[PDB]
Chain length 382, copies 4
Amino acid sequence: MSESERLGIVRDFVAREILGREGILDSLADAPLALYERFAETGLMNWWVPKEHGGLGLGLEESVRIVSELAYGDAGVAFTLFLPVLTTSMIGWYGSEELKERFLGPLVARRGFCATLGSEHEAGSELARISTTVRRDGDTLVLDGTKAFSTSTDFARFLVVIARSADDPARYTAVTVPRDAPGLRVDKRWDVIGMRASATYQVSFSDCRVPGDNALNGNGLRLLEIGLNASRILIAASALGVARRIRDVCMEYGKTKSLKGAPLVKDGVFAGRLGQFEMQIDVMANQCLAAARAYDATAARPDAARVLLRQGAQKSALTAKMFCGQTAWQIASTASEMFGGIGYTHDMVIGKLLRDVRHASIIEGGDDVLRDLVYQRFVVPT
Amino acid sequence: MSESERLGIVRDFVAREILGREGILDSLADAPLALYERFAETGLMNWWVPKEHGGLGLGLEESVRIVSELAYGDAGVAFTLFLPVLTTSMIGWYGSEELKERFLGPLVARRGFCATLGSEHEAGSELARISTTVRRDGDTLVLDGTKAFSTSTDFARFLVVIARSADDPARYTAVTVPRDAPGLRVDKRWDVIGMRASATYQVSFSDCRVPGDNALNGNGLRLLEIGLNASRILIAASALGVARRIRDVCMEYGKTKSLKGAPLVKDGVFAGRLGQFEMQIDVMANQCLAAARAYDATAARPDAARVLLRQGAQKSALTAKMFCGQTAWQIASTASEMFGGIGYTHDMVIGKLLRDVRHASIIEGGDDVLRDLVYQRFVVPTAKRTLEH
Amino acid sequence: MSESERLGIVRDFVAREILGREGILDSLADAPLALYERFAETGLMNWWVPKEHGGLGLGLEESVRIVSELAYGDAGVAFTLFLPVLTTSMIGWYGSEELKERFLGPLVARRGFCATLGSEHEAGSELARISTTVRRDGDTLVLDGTKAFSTSTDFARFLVVIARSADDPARYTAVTVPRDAPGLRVDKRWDVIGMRASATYQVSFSDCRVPGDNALNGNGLRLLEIGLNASRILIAASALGVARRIRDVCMEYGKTKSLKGAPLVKDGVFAGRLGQFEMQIDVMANQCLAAARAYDATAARPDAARVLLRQGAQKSALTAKMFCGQTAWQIASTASEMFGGIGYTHDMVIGKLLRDVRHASIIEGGDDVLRDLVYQRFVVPTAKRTLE
Amino acid sequence: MSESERLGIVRDFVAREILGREGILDSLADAPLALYERFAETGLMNWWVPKEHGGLGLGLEESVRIVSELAYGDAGVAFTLFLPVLTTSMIGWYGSEELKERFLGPLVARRGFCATLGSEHEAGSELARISTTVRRDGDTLVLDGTKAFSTSTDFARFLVVIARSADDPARYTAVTVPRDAPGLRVDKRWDVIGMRASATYQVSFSDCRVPGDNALNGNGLRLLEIGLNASRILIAASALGVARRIRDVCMEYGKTKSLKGAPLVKDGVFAGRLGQFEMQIDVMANQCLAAARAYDATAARPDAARVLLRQGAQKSALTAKMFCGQTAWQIASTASEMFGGIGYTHDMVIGKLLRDVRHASIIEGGDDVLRDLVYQRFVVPTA
Ligand SMILES: Cc1cc2c(cc1C)N(C[C@H](O)[C@H](O)[C@H](O)COP(=O)(O)OP(=O)(O)OC[C@H]1O[C@@H](n3cnc4c(N)ncnc43)[C@H](O)[C@@H]1O)c1[nH]c(=O)[nH]c(=O)c1N2
Ligand SMILES: Cc1cc2c(cc1C)N(C[C@H](O)[C@H](O)[C@H](O)COP(=O)(O)OP(=O)(O)OC[C@H]1O[C@@H](n3cnc4c(N)ncnc43)[C@H](O)[C@@H]1O)c1[nH]c(=O)[nH]c(=O)c1N2
Ligand SMILES: Cc1cc2c(cc1C)N(C[C@H](O)[C@H](O)[C@H](O)COP(=O)(O)OP(=O)(O)OC[C@H]1O[C@@H](n3cnc4c(N)ncnc43)[C@H](O)[C@@H]1O)c1[nH]c(=O)[nH]c(=O)c1N2
Ligand SMILES: Cc1cc2c(cc1C)N(C[C@H](O)[C@H](O)[C@H](O)COP(=O)(O)OP(=O)(O)OC[C@H]1O[C@@H](n3cnc4c(N)ncnc43)[C@H](O)[C@@H]1O)c1[nH]c(=O)[nH]c(=O)c1N2
């Protein structure tokens, strides 16, 4: 199947299961929504997983296009569908071959979800301070602690938990945990203000025991940073998709709205806003594609796992999320006033799109964290 | 009671009835919420209505402070409680003595709401194009048409409707209508994204008959512009109140959030944001008060109704709502990213405050409409006369 | 005469001596320009100095209107003419009666300038770290050190220098120094990017000796903060004046520029920008007037000097300079693109007005300094109190 | 000659002839400055001209890197050196072989400048209203009219003038004119507020006669739009280079400025600003490269001239100039306040860089014009 044919399948899924269903998608309905099963039936679930595990092995450049099309429909749906790339990419590069086969093989075959548990309430983004601990006890690993936010965990097949070693407090380990391990408790689902088609949870571990072979190889904080390269780029692509939707929603309104005796699409102030939007969308698209191409070129190296350990955070993954999160938010903010009073009602979608797009600058590192990281890694040394 | 004790009563009301009860206020609950009757128990309902019409006669300058305090708790509650100033000010200035005694005379003692119906879907802000018509039938006026948005109408005691005459080339008339006039239908309540403690309705008229004496005296679109001077200033005051709440929510979060081994209130980036917020709040407050003082000075003139026909839209009422609506949105927008992931949840109030404060730049004229009005009314005539000219 | 007649005199001065003379004012010519002596002849120099010293004693509210009219013509001319209020207000409240008669009397009668020397290179705005010292030597004070920027000093009658005592753990003192004091050296004039009708200097002291009675009474850094209340409000009023000029320059251009077959003043995008400008000018004006009225109400109190030591920096003086500096810069930035290519030449004044208005957010404390000061003085203590 | 080697030559030229010389560069000195002859001596003048006319034939992608390096030193020097691409690309695609041999050949070998005269005062960007006229007189063309702004004209070898046909008012023609043609008058040099190492002129024509074959083939307004694809992308690349310089000036100041007991490079507000600048520079770079790569792919087609007549303005050329002009101005605006009082003096370069970068959003179409063009061409039709 061609790349163009796959994108048409995604576009038909959006038109068929998302567009016109903003009501249910924005309702924080019992998870998972049936539409996720419908996406499974496309054959495109986990589309990035390598062919060695029965996946399609699609590159991140193609993923940018897929995610932009999904998020045009609903950013919470796109998020839920691409975010497992964070977990699978960490397992792909730093798990043993037997661990990869135990978890990734079934993930693809069963059309399932997985999740990564990094965030904690008190540590915040200062991840050296995380308090979730992992202890060796014979042939098992023992997890204890509370993890603040993780998406899809309740219906995931397995999780990767970033933990600090109690044995050596200077050591951090990523630990694979199956969903129904003893001692794993889903504490609650968060009442998110947007992306309300996604489900995000607080999770607690108390004497949670898993086999010793379940740890990934490497500093868990460095592995997390590497896994976030893919998800940060696709969060940027999601913001691009919402901005495209906002543009199209403005044009649909402008065709029928009258001002000064003509459709609003003929008005100079409106034209100026939409031309600025289109410029911004063009730049966001080129930035996402540049970042994805760089990601794919590195992942194609036969030594990619070792190369990525040296690299850590990819500069253009950080800058793509920063730029697209800021720009799509600014587009939504402008458009939130372009529909008069009806734009202040749920009869128009712009209110939802604005809440949805707000996630991009917040999740996986806010812009204070990421500005500092870009500065320390790519300005100070240069 | 002093002005200071009245504001203490308003603050106590917000503390007792609004703060901590944000869930019900954001729920679009069946209207009117019981808290509006509880506000009437303070003695402050319709606080601006002149002494000559049975009210406390508080000035708009004091109203700015009252609204700011109410909106600090909830902008939709504030909005519901001050918006009738638009209606009562038009009737007080331009209604006949008989009409004023019939509708304004009892309003304060009844603790009643009233509403103004200007907006329409097809006309937009081009109200010269309104399609709600008023036709004369002997000593009676007959209304027909659909009005797009009006706040509190369902539980209001009476309304003022802006209509175009069906008997004249281009004549506009403000017509007073009791809530239960036959022919008046409340079509639906709007599912608003914020201010969900306020209730706003679409309303239709079919052969709705009222006495000819129910028409206010004057060009109805000019009367509406004059009435909007007060509500535009108080919308600005509401945005100021929400901005003060956002500042305080940031400080409360910063006291217990840790960064680099110390509370966030010690961080330089945080301090910079809050110092900027405080500057913007100070500027908003001085603009609202300046606009209100100017309004009060005109309204105290003995010929105020005649003066206001000549003046029309007050420049600083327009610029107050423009500035405060923009600034408070910018503050909420900045603050929406200052709480990390928990700020993306309903565990924090910022998401609600962002939806609430968004109303200020939209309602009673968006900023494209208001920039053009300021330009045409004040910039163009001035440009004739400048030292650079 | 009346306040309106006074403002007409200022407007006439601007129309006759400033407007149309962009080239000379922007040239960093030998200072002071002759137009300053022309202004002296109006009888309005040092218009704020109290009548007890021969001055007109005009309030800061009126000063806002005067300065905005001057700055409409040229922000550097306005700056040069109002900035001595920083120095004279400190001397007026915290100098001895003898010191006030020795310096303020002649300043008015002789139509002179004076300056305040606070800023230093190494200390920056962290003026607790200033390295300019003052040492007692019997009944005389001895000053040593380098001061970074001070306006009009070379042709000023006298200065007030903020110094750190060499005889105390941490004592700061404001010291009056006559221009002809031996040991006072004007190192150089700064080649400023805008306000090139003003002259600002680096100044050094070496064994510069003055009588002990030349010291003002009080913590020198607090006195400075109090003196800056007036000058910060008037910097705000200057930015307001420049914003008014930018609005008017846009309207004059728009009347004769054609677009889509009609004057640009009929265009919707233009109307929106100018409506936004006018909103911002109105808000700036009301902020400046509020700050000035609060300043005037405090200064009218019989115990004003004592009250001001307790109050220090005035919240609305800081917020006025912050707001007007940011807003006038935003207006100039927008306008710098509104004239097409001719706007990128000296045939239009917008390039100069942009450079001129840039001063307002930089001078007398940048916005990083001022946001932090507003935060520490007004946000942190009131967070002890709030309904939430 | 590797590409990295060529870029090293450019960087060495910037270090030798530009850095530390802001005084002279900002002074609107007698033009052309001697440094342009020094650039000619590198062998890189007119580096984009195809090898068919003796040029190096470098693509626009490499040109983006070259211009960014030049503009890092001085945007006005960069502008003067790359802007002839507008003129040469028009002649290359729409001139006859004889015209190309007559004007493009010698341009490369003689290391000269050429210029395009499009803008007019009364027409503004409403170019259908241009009033400069061209009339046929036998086998010759007669030009009459005043052109508002043209860069390097006084020392150019030749010009392309956009004119309206006096015979058929519906027709627009691009006409090549030798600099020394009788009837061509350089009226004045504009006193520009920035890029004061460049020279831009008002030019008038009175009975200016040239051979008929000096005309390019095609609608002159469409040809101008096509030529502007390259120059608009390189204006964006110039703004990028100035933004990189501003970042570096901030870092050099922050290393020696003290704040709360530590160098300013340790301060959180400063780090936030510079991290934001670096993100914006990365995005600008990737947008310029994407636009240049699309330009190069189209220019490499055998039928490029025909393809480009259909295409007209390239979307990503417009969006690159729009984005980079806005972003680099915003960076300059923020930095103009980051140096305290010394930043308000000519002891610091930020004042000049601010004036320099201001050109990018203004020249070759302001953003009101370009937002409307992007809207009409790329938003409205895509139903
Ligand atoms: C819907 C949804 C979905 C998910 C998640 C959250 C949400 C809301 N997350 C967690 C999310 O990625 C996380 O919330 C963000 O990275 C932000 O980190 P914190 O909330 O800890 O705030 P954090 O502590 O980083 O920042 C909070 C505030 O503190 C200030 N601050 C922080 N750093 C600063 C600095 N350097 N300088 C100045 N100020 C600074 C700022 O005001 C900032 O807004 C997650 N997690 C996970 O592990 N797996 C998952 O699947 C998901 N998915
Ligand atoms: C919660 C709530 C409560 C109320 C109301 C609304 C809501 C949402 N209103 C109505 C409200 O005041 C009204 O919606 C606003 O004035 C805006 O008018 P329109 O919705 O018609 O949009 P409008 O047609 O004015 O604008 C829609 C869009 O058109 C564009 N546009 C409009 N004018 C333009 C211009 N000059 N130039 C360029 N673009 C332009 C802009 O994109 C703008 O966003 C009301 N009404 C009433 O009568 N009584 C009441 O009590 C209330 N209360
Ligand atoms: C034309 C002209 C005229 C005058 C003056 C200057 C000029 C240019 N001044 C001096 C002027 O008031 C002084 O330049 C400003 O107050 C700023 O002080 P510094 O230059 O020391 O920079 P300062 O050290 O305050 O700031 C420099 C940079 O450091 C950063 N920074 C500083 N504080 C920060 C913070 N808290 N947080 C984060 N970042 C921070 C910022 O990047 C800022 O731009 C003056 N002086 C005088 O005594 N008498 C006079 O008459 C005049 N008049
Ligand atoms: C240093 C320098 C160098 C050069 C040039 C200029 C300068 C200053 N130019 C000319 C330059 O490209 C030209 O100035 C710009 O394209 C802008 O065109 P106009 O100046 O005619 O203003 P234009 O008329 O396009 O715009 C002026 C103002 O009108 C308003 N406006 C315009 N269009 C609008 C719209 N659609 N909607 C709303 N408002 C609108 C805006 O306020 C705008 O700022 C040139 N020319 C040439 O032929 N050859 C060359 O080499 C050069 N190089």
